């Protein structure tokens, strides 16, 4: 009836998509070979007899990460033509991802999305998973967003992105790529859900009592968040929220479309026995800074719009009481021009747990999508790093040699400053 | 002889319609397959007011279900009593309004309203003499508000002399469900004040209040709220379906309750409502029913009636009762609380009695009150709309669909005029 | 020989008609199917062999109330054609009963009255039952009386109406309908008998020792009053009065034609044993204000004429003695220009009581018909209510939309004021 | 998909090439005859990056060996794993350079470089998509320096878009193996600064210090030094051959480590390194690896990193580990030693993880550092060159072959510019 198409770009996107499709297969009871022993059709297509193929596209400019997919357990799940690989990686270079190497593979990806969309009747939009710091996940993702906006237009596009972290980062040239990709995809995005690495590290260390979290745990948590977001589409509940409702309720102004994600409850089996997990306290836990998925401070910011997604054994009266209790609290605040600041969606299906996973089986869960002015702090630190690095013209020749110009750097800086000014003006 | 057609718009409208049709089928002794299985012929004499005889002694409800997403339609099809509805009546779109008034009124509503109007025209032509139209919907949504508004406008153009009733749920005062609720509510009220004959304002907070304090329900569910609303809906039109001592149809209630055309916003109430542990501790008589009526705790609108004055009051009683008790008790309740009744209208109360009580109850009664305290709800909604529109928040979502700021200003001005009138007659 | 036609309009008129015809069938021994195992000829027509059909017409703009008659016990009694029903009621609106909805059905009703008239050789007049407050019972009644006066002319028409109570009313727009119906039917009605629901409620509560009187009791008592009025025609007495005598003895002036009815004795079986019900005591009870059938105080008014209808084992000499005793009483007063104000009628057949009724079997009974200036008080209160409601122009648009004019409101107001002035002038 | 072609020049180049090929063959499970004998398929998935399939399930290295005398080539052919090399890839002369840069670059280099260029051109055209080239040679020799520089220039002319890496051993401070070392070193760096993408500086006394103090080796032999260098070489390109969590190829390392084109001189290091006795007295964890990295004793260049500042740092980890520990410990080591890190570059450290550890070890990692302290080595070479050029010593040996003193002055000026820039960014 209504369908959603997923795009996974870069190493981070591909691995997150692997975790996501594992979770979807577990939720709908589809074996890794695509067989099952009918609301799943929004994510899986039916081919021949007794086979379900995901409606996903996997893109990367280097073959090893997708070679792992093609050789792994889920080799039979995916269609061989929807796993596109290049030969040379972008090497953390935005110019290589956008012009030099991206343009050689972009048309094939567009053809694949067109073929996928030809099989959908009620397509809702696109979900793209990518990383800000990588060359591919910035440049090629921006190219893909631009071409998608040109070709399809009114269909909504949502991004799940890996924000560069304040103090724990892998690459060196990350500020350049992050600033450039934000400047490019500001005008072509409908809303972007933001997560950070050390934030999830802290959550795994503290709430999950894990000592050495790896990338797999982070990807599992992101998968749980995405499943909570799309549960309204993939199942039936008391009060459902589709893709368009998020965009129309969380975005007050076109340039302000950066909400942050937050999930609860994230607890292990040890502490699951000593807690009566009701609606109220998970609702409170979704609002505390120690539990949010971006390393940021909301106590010094002001909420603009709030969206809550409940799953499982949840009744509307408890939701209403919890929302009222949150509103009467002074430690958090809502901006003046938004007297009504909550959007509520409730689903019946409780969360499913992967075997060998870190999360415990829980009756209820909440996914929080909060739009706040506190993102300006992370913006500011990013601009500080970018300006400090660009003052010396370090690493500029790498970008210029691939066909970029310093004027693009200046334009990106000006656009980011304008975005910060917009956020500050809206805050007051 | 008199016929009523039913329309359901949006998720909330569809759910209330499903509950109402279940209740009506229970009253008339119709099983979920469409075959009559009652005992008293009184269940069958006036069954045509809500049901159509479709050969083989099978009765199909005279209802149209409208929505812009197939989800709720599929749920109501697969649920209990989902078979009796005619498959041709399910008119559903694919896009969905996305909680946007403009989309439901201008973009997708324009596409679907032609088919919905065709279906409603066929239904009305099939009947001998229709009394009017009634619609269940929501003013905070995008499908309900915009689509039901466009539908009401179209029918009022097509059928100007017939009665238009609405059972619409207005946004809650304390906690809201949607961020953009005030915009949709304000535009919907702007259209309703012109295009409808009488409106029954329902509030979810009032229903929670009733279910908690009065019904002692530990875990209320949306089904229970829809059950209460359906009980009120059945109570309103009981005299069209069953004989009684004093009969009052929709037109009678309209001519008795609305003195001025813009003042047609009522608050409903129902009695008796008792918990499981509290049935043994009261003798069910007319005094208890009329006490349960005139109480702020029992109102289904989140407005305190004692903060204003009643213009008119309608009390529709069901069951075998004495008229002397009813008249003398209405007089007494008028006398005791003279401060809450408008002085320039003697006899603010209109009465009607139906012989057949609801199944399981010996007596029941329905309260409809036209008070000036609805100005509080209108005022707070207008204030929230002004607060939002001052900073032009979320305005691009509505503007991109072809709407203009002049429409917003007109809606604000109309709500302000209405609250001014309600304050004036106070 | 001499016949009488009954017309019942509106819900109240129809239900009173059912009560009256049940009482007549009980009195004359006619079974509900119309057979009996010849003074009844003035009320029942003889058709075929052993079938008696009433000379009645039942009219209502809504079908339910007369559908009850067509389905009830007396379905075989009435001719199916003389039960006329509409599709839409007037909805407490005089304009709908008079112009918008009344004119669609009046021709068929007039045809039925004419057809009932052809079978009449000595028709005495028409009896009309209706309510002042209703929509149809006001508007259609007025239209019917206008057409009847145009068509037949000199034949007398008598009214039995439900005058609205001072403080106990059902509808809200009752003053409008009442004022309009008196304004329209002042010149077309020869005489009107008003009764009040409040007074009958009080009588049932006090004298009959009933706790919760319903409409059926009121209708039974009204039928007793009507039977007492018409017993002179339906039987043979020592000194009898016909329909014309009432009109020629009760109205001193054409515009003042509003006497009221009073019945005695109304007692239950419990108290009937402890009273020797003589003529004098029931004659005395007929003059007491607490026994009168209209909520009003005769003490503040003056009698112009009184009519007494004696029923049962009554002798003239006791009647004359009772009249003398009443005349000597200083508590009541007769206006100066009426030295003789008493009309006496004596009948032989005692009042029959319906099985399961609330009245006990009695030897004698009196039905009092008197004209008193105290009706001006009820008129004044009604006009005051009309003035209060019309000062704000409340509910005017309902009447105007159906084809009325506010000039009609002003004319009705002026005419009722003139009637009050005439009553005051007569009083002095 | 990505292919690396290997070049070996001179005696030292050939010896480290033989050792490196032995190590790689052991890693990929290839016996000294060229036949596959491993177990894990991961050894065969990316085997094409170093080996060609030459029919009959036999793999031959994609390497070219160069020398001006048959001696070293005869020795490597006769030694273990000498058979796997293709006989046609052995390109040798008869005269020899005699520790003279001019002979290796102008007199014999011109004659033999055409044949070497034909061989490398054939090898490159054989592969489908080449990542680049890597060269192992010396800057103090005559054949190594001259032929390596000339070949680097020729390939950079032929293939300008491909990565060019060198693992060159520089003349060492304390002891010198050749009298004319500074001249050859000077001309070598003159060519390297212009014609390469990244060069890894190796020093013999640094390796001796590691073997003595760290490895507790009583009698170190050139085999052990070449073993360490081969371990570093295999550690650098592990992500191209085996899967991992975060992957970094040669181009990624270049774009992350060199901020300005002339500043591409790194000082590599390897960990863990323990003796036979000291293996019991530590637990192999990431803290120990990252501690062994950031230590002057463990660096393969004879320059103290604490005398300058780190511009960029690359840490390539091998083995199954947690990324949280890696990130937290890089942050910690950055925070503790903020005085040794450049202030205008946040995140001096670039990380990469490969799942497959080297055979025998549970965990291992390679450190590449781009530090200003290489200015000390360049300054020492420059001062020695100036000291000898003041007296025109041994200048006729180089002049008779056709060289001009202007080339010497240009090379001296190039070192002066390089050291000036390195001091400037300090
Ligand atoms: N949360 C999470 N982040 C990841 C994962 N994989 C990579 N990243 C992030 O991606 C950033 C670097 O970009 P990569 O994804 O490694 O590379 P890329 O996006 O494919 O672009 P290229 O550099 O051209 O390969 C790192 O800083 C990580 O934070 C993952 O599995 N989970
Ligand atoms: N005495 C008596 N009065 C009645 C009875 N039924 C109705 N009434 C009076 O009628 C008044 C209202 O008018 P209705 O007769 O009910 O209405 P209607 O005459 O049918 O006119 P519509 O409004 O068109 O239905 C009430 O105020 C009652 O006082 C009855 O059975 N007995
Ligand atoms: N009483 C009642 N209210 C409901 C129900 N479902 C939704 N609502 C209310 O309707 C509002 C949501 O509007 P909705 O109908 O979902 O928007 P639409 O899909 O565009 O028509 C919320 O404020 C709810 O409080 C229901 O079953 N019963
Ligand atoms: N690390 C290492 N260095 C070597 C080896 N053999 C020679 N060298 C160095 O290379 C220099 C000798 O240069 P050489 O290669 O013989 O001159 P060429 O024949 O012109 O290339 C000496 O300074 C040695 O330090 C070896 O096997 N390993
Ligand atoms: Mg990558
Ligand atoms: Mg009626």
Residue numbers in the entry:
A (entry chain C), C (entry chain A): 1 to 37, 47 to 437
B (entry chain B), D (entry chain D): 1 to 426
Provide passages from the article that reported this PDB entry:
Additionally, we observed a slight (0.9 Å) compaction of spacing between adjacent tubulin dimers along a protofilament with respect to a taxol-microtubule lattice in the absence of HURP, raising the possibility that this protein could indirectly alter the recruitment of KIF18A and other factors by modifying the structural properties of the lattice.
The dynamics of kinetochore-attached microtubules are regulated by hepatoma-upregulated protein (HURP) and the mitotic kinesin-8 Kif18A, but the underlying mechanism remains elusive. Hepatoma-upregulated protein (HURP) is a spindle assembly factor that localizes to the chromatin-proximal region of K-fibers in a process mediated by Ran-GTP signaling. Through its stabilizing and bundling activities, HURP regulates K-fiber dynamics and spindle morphology, contributing to chromosomal movements and alignment. K-fibers also recruit Kif18A, a member of the kinesin-8 family that walks towards and accumulates at the plus-ends of K-microtubules.
